[PDB]
Symmetry: C3
Subunit: 237 residues, 3 copies
């Protein structure tokens, strides 16, 4: 119950990652909570768009180290196959699955001061979220290599240039823009919106599902490597 859900406007549900003490870090129940909200909103004929965001000037710092990867994979599988529009609004940290889940949102906006990173390689792990398939397609392979292979931190402007964001707002302004765009989505003919999203994703969809499964298997392998063991011990200083 660290995942907030409210109908904030007609046709629009807002799903909020709410754990600011731990930078909205995703607990196992958070993944379940996120699966429940999306599922309910998909089944709800009231609802024509979803906005996804985090509380307290933070999006999410990613997977909670304390609170294997199968539930993360279930969430990505749910997120990537949702039939209705999903609009993301990012402030502060969007790290790990914080970044890669943006790949499956139809629209994404971040304020200045946002900080993105995929540090899987540095933890002796491997890509997730179908990032190893999608990111070369939307960012070009050069940029996909600097972000996934080097695991460089990056700001919203690079995130725009890399195909992760439609637009950068000033700081604290991403949610207002996200809600505006969700409103315009909700005012459109919903069947036509759904058909368009499905056709937009038609060519990538089987490769995304097979990539999530293949990444998950390797990620599970990598969680058992000596490199991951040493890197986590290094990450705890």
């Amino acid at each position: 119950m660290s995942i907030l859900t409210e109908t904030v406007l007609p046709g629009i549900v807002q799903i909020t990652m709410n754990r600011p003490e731990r930078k909205n870090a995703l607990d196992r129940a958070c993944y379940q909570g996120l699966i429940d909200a999306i599922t309910a909103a998909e089944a709800d004929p009231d609802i024509r768009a979803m906005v996804l965001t985090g509380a307290g000037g933070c999006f999410t710092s990613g997977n909670d180290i304390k609170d294997g990867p199968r539930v993360a994979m279930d969430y990505l599988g749910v997120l990537s196959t949702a039939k209705k529009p999903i609009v993301a609004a990012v402030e502060g940290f969007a790290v790990g699955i914080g970044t890669t889940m943006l790949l499956h949102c139809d629209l994404a906006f971040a304020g200045k001061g946002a900080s993105f990173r995929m540090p899987f390689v540095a933890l002796g792990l491997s890509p997730e979220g179908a990032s190893s398939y999608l990111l070369p397609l939307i960012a070009g392979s050069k940029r996909a290599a600097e972000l996934l292979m080097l695991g460089e931190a990056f700001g919203p402007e690079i995130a725009h240039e890399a195909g992760l964001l439609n637009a950068v707002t000033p700081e604290g302004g991403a949610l207002a823009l996200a809600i505006e765009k969700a409103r315009a989505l909700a005012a459109l003919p919903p069947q036509s919106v759904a058909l368009t999203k499905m056709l937009l994703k038609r060519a990538q969809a089987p490769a995304v599902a097979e990539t999530i499964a293949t990444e998950g298997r390797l990620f599970g392998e990598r969680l058992l490597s000596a490199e991951a063991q040493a890197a986590f011990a290094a990450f705890l200083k």
Copy 2:
């Protein structure tokens, strides 16, 4: 006979959408006219490049509501498989198939003040022109969603950033640049130009042809939906 054709320079045919009273709106005969010009230029060993443009500070406002989609599909099928270079030059409105036909031109230039839009979703319709396949590839999925799913109007700079335009000229200057580039194409060894274009398009070509057919079937379905009926009635105020 609202489609003008002239050999304007050695090796170069200019095909002009000429209906300024209706913003070069495409009539059923216009599609046929456009099919005839491309076909003749393809068969003509005189001809090494085509420039495509509209008269009167306008490219086209798209499909003429008065004057089903099979002939549009035949034109796209013809445009997408032409063996010789096609260079587009856009002023003013390039709306609907006005925009999506740019996907199949090898080069495209627009002046400042150009206005692009794919408003299919707003009319309770669905994507066409193989836009649902190509646009995610050239623009990234984020930007493809704002343009097709929201149907936002957009200018030439966004059209450049979205992979629809090689370059933006000042207003009224797109045709001069288009002709310059067609001249350089015509001065090159034509068999080598043709082989290069074919290899550039080799990976996308079957998916484009199957997407045009699949979009056309859904578009035909959607022309019969209640949503399209209501949206057109709304569009007529």
Copy 3:
């Protein structure tokens, strides 16, 4: 022995195209030399990254006209399947295979004043390096057509915008940045780096190998055309 190899830092080999009198033009032995360096570095467990560059303010002017294409193809086949990171650093001319080999490097940087070109079409030839497949994917089809079909010369900023370069440095500064990024690659867990690179390239890899073979066959055909014969005679004034 115009290909220099040195371990310049721990874990890092630098491979230098060294023929400044002929703008580092690639001789048949240069291709062999480049195959040997990559192969040795791949087999060497000391080595975690490769930097590739040219001497004398030049990257390479490409295939040496004097000193058929099968050895070029063997090099590309080797370059495109290397398991360890490869970082390119470009000054001056990067022409022909000078440009297309950048497609297979994981990272690439050039200084201001760099000059890129794929002039295959102008020589009555055809694309190589799997450029006809990769370049539309990373640059969009519009830009791939201006570069391959027109064979326009272009600078590093366009090379960045076209997905050939991670970043542009000032003149003479590309090697320093390349070495910095290779150092960061070498400091990361190598198995995790290798797994990530392999997953990044997993979807493109069979199409790259089949495209290299198909381009090579057509390139060989084109080396025998009258157009190539006339264009080379024209190129010699």
